[PDB]
């Protein structure tokens, strides 16, 4: 119950925020071109 809940929580959070990080990495360089090395 303890290790069960802890590992379930860790996996769920990991998956959710991995998806979100994939989307943010897709949409980053457009909205912040000052960091984009294409324009440097």
């Amino acid at each position: 119950s303890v290790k069960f809940m802890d590992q379930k929580r860790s996996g769920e959070e990991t998956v959710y925020f991995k998806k979100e990080d994939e989307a943010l990495l897709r949409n980053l360089l457009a909205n912040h071109p000052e960091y984009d090395p294409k324009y440097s």
């Binding site: 809940m5 990080d21 990495l25 897709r26």
Partner: protein
């Protein structure tokens, strides 16, 4: 071991805590003899967050607005509040899931995870474990970065970026690299 009107001794004591039990008489007695405290955890080291400092058990007499200014005090207390909030949401996440959390709670969880990953940093002596080079982060940079993360400026930045980075600028560089490698 104490400062006097002739000199000063700054001591740094490592206290073994057997079986991770802080209720043992030896550390229990030693807690009262210290000005600054830093409690390391296994649950954090399991996440690869080294140094494995628990920021909710670490304390210090110096963390007061008159010694360190309010820009430091309020920043630290906001970080601690955020992490405690993330700790209270753990069971709801474990039973129901992230789907049930509101967008405020999701923002809280994201910022707390970013803070957790950001407090990590690589040491120069740990090169023989990680291979990565070491960093020396001054304090104003830390305060700027923490204020920036708590204010919500870096929500767009990915969580992975805040890993073993001395400063926020390094985090931006890592995010740029990860986005370029994505395509």
């Amino acid at each position: 071991i104490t400062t006097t009107k002739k000199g000063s001794i700054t001591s740094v004591q490592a206290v073994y805590v057997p079986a991770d039990d802080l209720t043992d008489p030896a550390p229990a007695t030693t807690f009262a003899h210290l000005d600054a405290t830093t409690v390391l955890s296994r649950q954090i080291a399991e996440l690869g967050i080294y140094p494995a400092v628990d920021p909710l058990d670490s304390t210090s007499r110096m963390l007061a607005p008159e010694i360190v200014g309010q820009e430091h005090y309020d920043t630290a207390r906001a970080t601690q509040k955020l992490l405690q909030d993330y700790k209270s949401l753990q069971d709801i996440i474990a039973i129901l899931g992230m789907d049930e959390l509101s967008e405020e709670d999701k923002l809280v969880v994201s910022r707390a995870r970013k803070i957790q990953r950001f407090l990590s940093q690589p040491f120069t002596v740990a090169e023989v474990f990680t291979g990565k080079p070491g960093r020396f982060v001054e304090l104003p940079e830390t305060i700027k970065s923490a204020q920036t993360i708590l204010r919500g400026e870096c929500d767009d930045l990915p969580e992975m970026a805040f890993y073993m980075c001395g400063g926020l600028e390094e985090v931006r560089s890592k995010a740029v690299k990860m986005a370029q490698e994505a395509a």
